[PDB]
Symmetry: D2
Subunit: 313 residues, 4 copies
């Protein structure tokens, strides 16, 4: 489909909304991302039964997480959620609405992880935090009132990468705790090898994820560009056998579309149960716009339901 009518206007408004340029400093981009994000969060105005912030001891130091509990009960399913933002931007705050809605619709406790950001903390800082936090959720199921046997990982964009890699790390360690993975338009190839979608939808006219911003993200994340060949950076090059069932959500007008769909297919070739759906008429990051985009609401509903019944399994 063409770009949704309402989304043209949304991008039109972000046209003269202080645009990104490669020489901008990280603090300014972070601030703008947070402020813009919080408009959408406040718009959503999601309820939640119970919410609190906790500290998880990571290899790199204390890791903050937000626990969203949508109902009472001592053995609820859990989702460890990783926010997007290019490995450089975002926080539990920027994605607070998505996490509340996810909890409410799935009935699962959502644990949103405030993983360390680049360039202050280069790859593999965030990957370590992401595994450490998910493992801690498994180990501390009792304190949390969750079922240690019903933990899923999930994340959007750079967070989809962290979810995918956490599942790989658990697999590599011979661990059972990741039962399900939902990858929301993940980045799975962090090298400069192109796909058609990466070039097709990354021009300045798409705004949300441009070629300039992608390269800038890549420069912040990596100590040296060859680090991108690591399967913990580019999980599309990993051994994909024995990974947990996967739902991969993609967007039609998204640079990362091709690689997301390729990841789903490659999972299948190694015997993993895996589904790839493409949301038509929308851009990368569309889920965060759900208060004003019907595709965003449909996506949260699908993701929530897929986790609740582990439908792909």
């Amino acid at each position: 489909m063409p770009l949704s009518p309402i989304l043209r206007q949304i991008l039109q408004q972000l046209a003269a909304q202080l645009q990104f340029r490669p020489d901008m400093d990280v603090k300014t981009v972070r601030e703008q991302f947070e402020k813009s994000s919080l408009i959408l969060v406040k718009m959503a105005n999601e309820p939640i039964h119970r919410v609190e912030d906790i500290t998880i001891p990571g290899r790199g130091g204390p890791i903050r997480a937000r626990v969203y509990r949508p109902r009472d009960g001592e053995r609820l399913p859990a989702v460890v959620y990783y926010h997007g933002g290019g490995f450089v931007l975002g926080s539990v705050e920027t994605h607070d609405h998505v996490c509340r809605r996810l909890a409410n619709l799935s009935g699962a406790v959502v644990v949103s992880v405030d993983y360390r950001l680049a360039p202050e903390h280069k790859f593999p800082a965030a990957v370590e935090d992401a595994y450490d936090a998910a493992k801690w959720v498994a180990d501390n199921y009792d304190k949390l009132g969750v079922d240690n046997g019903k933990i899923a990982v999930a994340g959007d964009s750079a967070g989809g990468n962290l979810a995918a890699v956490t599942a790989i790390m658990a697999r590599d360690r011979g661990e059972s705790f990741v039962k399900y993975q939902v990858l929301i338009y993940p980045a799975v190839n962090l090298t400069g090898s192109p796909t058609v979608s990466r070039v097709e939808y990354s021009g300045p006219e798409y705004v949300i994820l441009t070629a300039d911003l992608m390269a800038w993200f890549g420069r912040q994340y990596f100590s040296k560009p060859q680090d991108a060949l690591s399967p913990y950076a580019s999980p599309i090059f990993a051994d994909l056998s024995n990974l947990p069932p996967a739902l991969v959500i993609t967007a039609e007008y998204d640079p990362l579309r091709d690689e997301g769909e390729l990841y789903a297919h490659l999972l299948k070739t190694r015997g993993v149960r895996a589904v790839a759906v493409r949301y038509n008429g929308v851009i990368h990051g569309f889920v965060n716009f759900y208060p004003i985009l019907e595709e965003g609401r449909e996506a949260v509903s699908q993701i929530a339901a897929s986790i609740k019944s582990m439908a792909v399994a």
Copy 2:
């Protein structure tokens, strides 16, 4: 994606009498229904009085309660084949996951009952669900319509028919790879995924359904035949599921977009790696299982609205 590996395997394994093709489709469908092995809390067959006589329906009740949400479901089969039986697993599972009463409508089949036979029954069945909320133990303000392939067409047209009479009982429409253009105006996808190598929906079978369904070629120009040419304003919110390797993909995706252009909230999602009719294969296809989960949940929260 390419074609999912198990689906290639299945396909590689796989002027006729209308009665003979029905038996074959029936036989094949029931293999999948038995594989599903789905439970249901309560199930019963009823007789909806319709304009062409008694319309058989099957009521799937997943739980107790008055004022449950409702889904009027229309089975696929190209307007000529299929029954409440061929789609029983999908309806049990839909009922169970959505928490809603599903009324599966055994609409009149062509070529015996040609267009607009099935369309009248589709509308009569749905409005009868609307007029009997109390007896059904369903809420008259939470009625959805849903259907697959030729069923998706009836679902969409039932919504159009209700709109046309100023009726507002249709609150939500899930169109599972629907047929919205029944004329021969080709789309890229219609030509691309209709070769013999696809089997389930070939150019020959499509042309054959069309000859069974219509009394004359020109009847496909009707908005009740080809909803994609109808006025789409003031229609209920829509979820349109499409398959990647499906002749009807393009028209399905176009229908969602045309709905948007007339101010209706609507979402088109494409399941990669799969063919038309993949929902019925859910017991051996993860895409099938995800679709039923999405459809159930989208109806439960009316997410697109």
Copy 3:
């Protein structure tokens, strides 16, 4: 490809009176024609007698000799705009590279002369080239037809018209991003590349051309209006050029394939990174220069045949 960089730059730079839009198109076209700065060995304007009166044509002779190959060329402009002047550079260059005499036909424009006006002239002009080989110094066994956009439509329909009368003077047809379906039956590409951001062929301009061209909506069902619905058997070999970012892409590619299905040799090639009408931009677009080179050469060796 994405949109080629220079073309984005060009686009970013860029109830009306029919006369006013013509002047604007004319003015814009002539900028490109002067940029081209093309030579021609011999050029002259002639008056072909046609069924609606005198049809102006322009004869471009690239070299000496009797029995040169011939190309009857039809300019674009949505049936309403354009002239032999707006496409002069393309015809000089075509003539020069193919070695063939190009007869550019100044067909009658709508809304003054509505369908089937231009179609009769298109056929009359071509058959007149056929009947006057001697006077033109061209071979009556080496006649091709060619045209861009609305011109591609006339080229294809002229071939259909000749076929319909048992006439065999049309030996080859090059359809440069043709309009083969003039009904509103949407294709994915028609919706995808017709937004205001594309400018050259928007949904509004297409709907406007259609209202100028036809006396009534139903006339677009004619095979002389929408050739993609005509019988395509026994038609001359075809080269179909399409643009990647073009509303008419899908129907263009479908026309080549439908030709194949009726046993006609036909090739569809898609130029990436470019929009409808890109051939006329050849002086600043390498894709334009390649297209003219391909078209000239394909006609010279009748390569698809």
Copy 4:
């Protein structure tokens, strides 16, 4: 478009035509390729005014080339042509028909190069030969009766790779002799980074270039897999500035489609004049089937004409 009606039959016939498997020895695959190729060559039955075989001294030893002269005259345009075959298969013989027709239609002398094959001669053996032969043509213009100022490179598939890399090598050396490049469905990314087309069209049902055969080619060509990162292996990662005007021909149902179209686009981004055309309804290698495929005839006509007027320039 769908797969051409006649091409289904062609692939149907190649279904039970002794199919490839990864453990086959190189000699057997070479023999089958040659025999199959020569059916098409004999079918074409192309004339040529003058033809002879010569020896070109390369860094690695004598290099055989075939000179196709379509007309008389002492300063004709030239095309140095590189046959396809995965870097492992093929010869001047397998592509003899295409070269004669090219010469005849373009009016250029075609020099078809019998470059060294893998695994006997690993990368960069063939790349060295390909540059050496093109340079020799420039240096020996007088002996050949060609214009040293009007030399083009051209090649199909693995040969498109060699043509692209020869142009890069000349550029890197600050040389002017390559004036034009025609890349016929080239392979420009020899790493295992996927594109959608690479996965979509490489199943056994397409026969001509399957995932199995692509990996086998890759194993023969490279001494070690990391050699594939070299820009002389994967020219899509090279600096593409100041390269000669480019025509890139692609096929709709070809694993290499995406990367070919990406190469054309990337050339443009560095200011190179570059056109990508996609032939619908056909597979990789379709040009060699021109006696029975109208798309093959159209392609040779286009390629010939583009070289004759250097139309993209």
